[PDB]
């Protein structure tokens, strides 16, 4: 069922054609669904009446088919447009768009050809094995409020570190990985620690 999306397209169109063909067996009120039987039995003055009924029915059947193909084609076009967009943004680049190139943080994608379609293999980064830390919005040192330049301030229960947000990597809090803005009397939840100066 993995390729159901492509099989569904095949099935819908095959069904539409089969229906269209089967409509040629309908009388539509005529003495026969077979045009040759009408022509071999009746003279023109009467044959035309029977044929008119078949033409009306068969033209209506064909207009139904075409209308449904136009609507279905529009759906396929939209799908193709999406596929083209993903090719550009997932394969020819790295996308920031959430859930656009698979679940997780998109790294890259690889296209694979399929029958009347495309398959994208989305390679994503998925965070794992998280653990609890105590955190603070800022560190108070020498009366100054220090904020992390890239990461977040965390405590392992005794010591404060600064770490990149998506991967635990506890560095010593220093003036090279923080910046100062204002004093310690403004930030809510600010905690006291040392900020090391190299």
């Amino acid at each position: 069922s993995a390729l159901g999306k492509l099989q569904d397209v095949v099935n819908q169109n095959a069904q539409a054609l089969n229906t269209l063909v089967k409509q040629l067996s309908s009388n539509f009120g005529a003495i026969s669904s077979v045009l040759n039987d009408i022509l071999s039995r009746l003279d023109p003055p009467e044959a035309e009446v029977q044929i008119d009924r078949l033409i009306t029915g068969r033209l209506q059947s064909l207009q139904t088919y075409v209308t449904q193909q136009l609507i279905r084609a529009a759906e396929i076009r939209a799908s193709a447009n999406l596929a083209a967009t993903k090719m550009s943004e997932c394969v020819l680049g790295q996308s920031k768009r959430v859930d656009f190139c698979g679940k997780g943080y998109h790294l890259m994608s690889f296209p694979q050809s399929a029958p009347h379609g495309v398959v994208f293999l989305h390679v994503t980064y998925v965070p794992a094995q998280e653990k609890n830390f105590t955190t603070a919005p800022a560190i108070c040192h020498d009366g100054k409020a220090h904020f992390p330049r890239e990461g977040v301030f965390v405590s392992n229960g005794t010591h404060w570190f600064v770490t990149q947000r998506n991967f635990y990597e506890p560095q010593i809090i220093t003036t090279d990985n923080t910046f100062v803005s204002g004093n310690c009397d403004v930030v809510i939840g600010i905690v006291n620690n040392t900020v090391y100066d190299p």
Binding site: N13, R58, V154, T163, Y168
Partner: protein, 86 residues
């Protein structure tokens, strides 16, 4: 049910992922006999939120998922005159 009268399925209180949709929150599945149930929307997950607690990944996995999209459709051509009149 709100979808109509369902006969031949055993209704149970146990909620499962939806298998065969009935309507109005009701789904049926084969478990043997056919059963009816209110579909689950997923497992409950209470996040350990606090004003000073953060969870940080110590590891990661590389996941590969497959997305399948239709691109093209069979290029049919129907001869109107022949179809109708042969």
């Amino acid at each position: 049910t709100r979808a109509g009268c369902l006969i031949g399925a055993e209704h149970v209180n146990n909620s499962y992922e939806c298998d065969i949709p009935i309507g109005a929150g009701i789904c049926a599945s084969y478990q043997q006999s056919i059963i009816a149930y209110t579909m689950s929307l997923g497992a409950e997950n209470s996040v350990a939120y606090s004003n000073n607690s953060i969870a940080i990944p110590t590891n990661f996995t590389i996941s590969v998922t497959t997305e399948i999209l239709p691109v093209s459709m069979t290029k049919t051509s129907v001869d109107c005159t022949m179809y109708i009149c042969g």
